[PDB]
Amino acid sequence: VHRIRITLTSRNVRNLEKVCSDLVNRAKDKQLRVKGPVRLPTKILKITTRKTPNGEGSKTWETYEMRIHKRLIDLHSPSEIVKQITSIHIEPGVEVEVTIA
Template sequence: MDYPKKTQAAPAEGQTVRLTITSRNAKAVESVTSQLLMRARDEKVTIHGPVRLPTRTLKITTRKTPCGNGTNTWDTFELKIYKRIIDLHAPTEQVKKITSFTMESGVDVSITILDR
């Protein structure tokens, strides 16, 4: 007896696009993320996220005195980086509409097309 061959369903129109939002300012990341989500919901796009990645803390410890004399006193400087990931399943034209607005300064948004 021959079993029917399994066929893959035709892929839905569009592609999966990953938006990665990065900044040193937590409020700026949250506001840009909420604007992107609001615009994506208006376009009726399938959304996965936002995924809040752990905050990356970069630390540098240096001596306070430049000459090396005196007591050993140290300064610690920190830089915190906040990151969010949003996956959208939409055609390229809709992604352009969603991401075409004025974002706050200091916020990086990178767009990656995923193969699935």
């Protein structure tokens, strides 16, 4: 009736994995259909620019990369447990969002 979907979008692999491990461990501490992590395709943004501030010089083009990683988690937790786990899952560099309905 009340399914909680939370986002696990970030760029730091280590910290997003740590957040994902923490919530999965809590979801295994209290049985909530033990739904595990789900991995989404990486959204990588490729931009190519020049290096020379002026126009003089050889044709050199620098390509930069910007990739983000998304994960989704579905839980059957009650409101009190949901607010508790979100309180303990405060980490830097991790953006989370919960959709109710």
